[PDB]
């Protein structure tokens, strides 16, 4: 009896258009540990996505950090879509460079 995931989408370094950077999708506070995490560019799934190993917090909830190489432009939008037993539907949260 699950705890629904909290998502944050943000870059490792301050974004700047045209400059290579990394995008993170930090998913925390969830249970059970089974979770599907997807990162998106303009709606399509980004192929190569790193995923840290399963870990949990002193309060027993799990967390995972997903990340990928990306080059922000003015126009491309990025997002992260998580799927977990606690939610009837997948939650998508969009990257907001600010």
């Amino acid at each position: 009896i699950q705890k629904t995931p909290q998502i944050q989408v943000y870059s490792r370094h301050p974004p700047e258009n045209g400059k290579p950077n990394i995008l993170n999708c930090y998913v925390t506070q969830f249970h059970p540990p089974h979770i599907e995490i997807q990162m998106l560019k303009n709606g399509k799934k980004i192929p190569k996505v790193e995923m840290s190993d399963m870990s949990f917090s002193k309060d027993w909830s799990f967390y995972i950090l997903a990340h990928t190489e990306f080059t922000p432009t003015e126009t491309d939008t990025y997002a992260c879509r998580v799927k977990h037993d606690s939610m009837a539907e997948p939650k998508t949260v969009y990257w907001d460079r600010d």
Partner: protein, 276 residues
């Protein structure tokens, strides 16, 4: 001056295969340093920080066998809990464990830890006295008794006061120049155009380590919790963390708004305002 070590063990059973997946993670001062994963091709505890590569083969073989032992332990336990809660087959279940010790700056044992959780929920824990147990669930009482009547507490007490302390010492020595660092916060502020005549001020804290940090916006009166918007502290992915908190301000009336950053590896709280 304060140090610690922790091993966070987990076992998950799925409708899947005939057997649980068991993961063990060790931390010294809150940073991963070893890891075992029964899913690996060649299940073994592997070093997770460069300083650990010092320990010779005897060390890894031993810890590996300990791991296999634990895995067996979690498998039998998963089985019993199933009966204790009268859950039938065909579900997923989790069993987790946290254990370790905390030392003060004088390297003396401050407190031992040894608590278990089932389905993410507290199941039983060893009280700080290292002699009595806490277990709330009615189902957990069975375990409480068994363990009470079998002297478990003495056993874990010994580990906590002995090995957990003694090894952490050895570890801390072998990693002095690696984990004795605090990466100080480098904070700046951004201006963001909002509802006509109102602007959002964002106070950023980047590349700091360890994660603990606090940010506040003193309109410089002395206090603002006025729907100040922030975010959980996050991984940058490079070992440092990031955070930010913002506040809605009258465009123009915005220098008399200061951000404070308390972080530890920092002489004094940081103090900033807006700056083209």
């Amino acid at each position: 001056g304060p140090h610690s070590m922790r091993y966070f063990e987990t076992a998950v059973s799925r409708p899947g295969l005939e057997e649980p997946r068991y993961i063990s993670v060790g931390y010294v001062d809150n940073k991963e340093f070893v890891r075992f994963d029964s899913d690996a091709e060649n299940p073994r505890y592997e070093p997770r920080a460069p300083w650990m590569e010092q320990e010779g083969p005897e060390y890894w073989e031993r810890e590996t066998q300990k791991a296999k032992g634990q895995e067996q332990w979690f498998r039998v336990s998963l089985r019993n809990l199933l009966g204790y809660y009268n859950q039938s087959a065909g579900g997923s279940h989790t069993l987790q464990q946290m254990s370790g010790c905390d030392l003060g700056s004088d390297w003396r044992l401050l407190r031992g830890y040894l608590q278990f959780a089932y389905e993410g929920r507290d199941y039983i824990a060893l009280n700080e006295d290292l002699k009595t147990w806490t277990a709330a669930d009615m189902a957990a009482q069975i375990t409480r008794r068994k363990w009470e009547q079998s002297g478990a507490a003495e056993h874990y007490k010994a580990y906590l006061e002995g090995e957990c302390v003694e090894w952490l010492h050895r570890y801390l020595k072998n990693g002095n120049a690696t984990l004795l660092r605090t990466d100080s916060p480098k904070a700046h502020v951004t201006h963001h155009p909002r509802s006509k005549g109102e602007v959002t001020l964002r106070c950023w804290a980047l590349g700091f380590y360890p994660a603990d940090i606090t940010l506040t916006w003193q309109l410089n009166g002395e206090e603002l919790t006025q729907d100040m918007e922030l975010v959980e502290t996050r991984p940058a992915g490079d070992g440092t963390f990031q955070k930010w908190a913002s506040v809605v301000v009258p465009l123009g009336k915005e220098q008399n708004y200061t951000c404070r950053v308390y972080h530890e590896g920092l002489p004094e709280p940081l103090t900033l305002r807006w700056e083209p």
